[PDB]
Structure 1
Amino acid sequence: VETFAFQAEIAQLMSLIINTFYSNKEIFLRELISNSSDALDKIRYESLTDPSKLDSGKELHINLIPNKQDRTLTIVDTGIGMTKADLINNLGTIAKSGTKAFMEALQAGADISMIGQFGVGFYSAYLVAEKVTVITKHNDDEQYAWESSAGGSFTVRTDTGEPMGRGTKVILHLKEDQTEYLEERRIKEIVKKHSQFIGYPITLFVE
């Protein structure tokens, strides 16, 4: 288990997301599905010239998995996945420069729903989650588990859990008052509203 400190600007983005009074929290799902879509686009582009890039899984899809007993919402995709270097380097984002632009936008009038325009939409997960576990598998690396309850640190470990072939799994350990995002009709509503032009099947698992 390795423990790393976020870069100051990233810990400042995370505490802004957690602390600001802002009711439109549902946008986290749009932000996580949009990332899944971008990673699936990346593996699909690679497969156009190299069919073997799909040996670790031919099906390109997004699964939404609520679990009321564990109080988790899991978003699974069969995208390009991330390397350890990608996980440590802010989950494949240019987060330092993205946070800086997002902060200027907010001061000038923008709102938290615009986070994805600054390439840092992943961190919108902390609107509804107290802890986020990122499980990922890239063709060029091993399966890793990134985890953080914010508070300025995150951990990285080799995942000894269930292998995923390729892709990314975001486990959201929801806040106590945010369990509406485990209800079928609520997730369905959010998908129809914000993710209607995703070019991959979005399957909402039932319990």
Structure 2
Amino acid sequence: VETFAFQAEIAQLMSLIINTFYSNKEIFLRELISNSSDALDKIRYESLTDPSKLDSGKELHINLIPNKQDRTLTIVDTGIGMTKADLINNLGTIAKSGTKAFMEALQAGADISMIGQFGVGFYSAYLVAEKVTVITKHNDDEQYAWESSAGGSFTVRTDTGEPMGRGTKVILHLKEDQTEYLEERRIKEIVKKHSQFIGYPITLFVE
């Protein structure tokens, strides 16, 4: 298990998201689904020049899995996945410019709902989750588990859980007062409102 500090600006954006009063929390789902969609476009595109890239799974989809007992909402995709270099350094470097532009936009009167336009949409997960666990598998690498409860740090470890072939799985450990995102009618209403035109099947699992 390796522990890493977030870049100062990312830690700052996460504290802003956790501490600001903002009732329109549902926007987190559209952001996560959008990231899943981008990952699926990436593997779909790469497979046109190299079909062997689909040997770790042909089906390109998104699964929404609520679990009332564990108090979790899982977003699973069969996209390109991420390498250790994406998790640790690469994505953090890009997030720096996006974070800065977003905070600047917020000071100038922009809304938290515009987070996605700055490429930092993922951090809206902290409107509803006390902890986020990300399981990922890229064709060129091993299966990894990324994790953060904010507080300025994240961990990366090799995942010795059930293999997932290829893709990314986002496990949202919800805050006690955010259990409405475990309700079928609530998730359906959110998907229909903000994610109706995603070019991949979205299956909302029932309990």
Contact 2:6/2:92 (<8 A) preserved = no
- CA shift at 1:88, angstroms? 1.2
Structure 1 range deviating more: 10-19 or 92-101: 92-101
- CA shift at 1:112, angstroms? 0.5
The size of the alignment, in residue pairs, is 207
Aligned positions of 1:17-166 closer than 5 A: 17-89=17-89, 91=91, 94-166=94-166
Structure with greater helix share of residues: 2
Give the secondary structure class of the aligned counterpart of 1:139.
coil
Cα distance in 1 for partners of 2:118, 2:93 equals 10
What are structure 1's unaligned runs of at least 5 residues? Answer: none
- CA shift at 1:89, angstroms? 2.7
Q: What CA deviation, in whole Å up to 9, does each residue of 1:50-94 have, x standing for no partner?
A: 110000000000000000000000000000000011011365771
Q: Which runs of 4+ in 1 moved over 4 A?
A: 90-93
Give the secondary structure class of the aligned counterpart of 2:49.
coil
Cα distance in 2 for partners of 1:94, 1:178 equals 30
Cα distance in 1 for partners of 2:4, 2:92 equals 16
**CA gap 1:114/1:9 in 2 versus in 1, 3 angstroms:** same
Q: Name the TM-score, length of structure 1 as normaliser.
A: 0.98
Cα RMSD after superposing both structures: 1.0
Q: Which residue of 2 aligns with 1:13?
A: 13
Contact 1:93/1:120 (<8 A) preserved = no
**CA gap 1:2/1:72 in 2 versus in 1, 3 angstroms:** same
Cα distance in 2 for partners of 1:74, 1:188 equals 14
What are structure 2's unaligned runs of at least 5 residues? Answer: none
- CA shift at 1:141, angstroms? 0.6
Q: Which residue of 2 aligns with 1:189?
A: 189
Cα distance in 2 for partners of 1:174, 1:193 equals 21
Structure 1 range deviating more: 88-97 or 18-27: 88-97
What is the aligned-residue identity percentage? 100
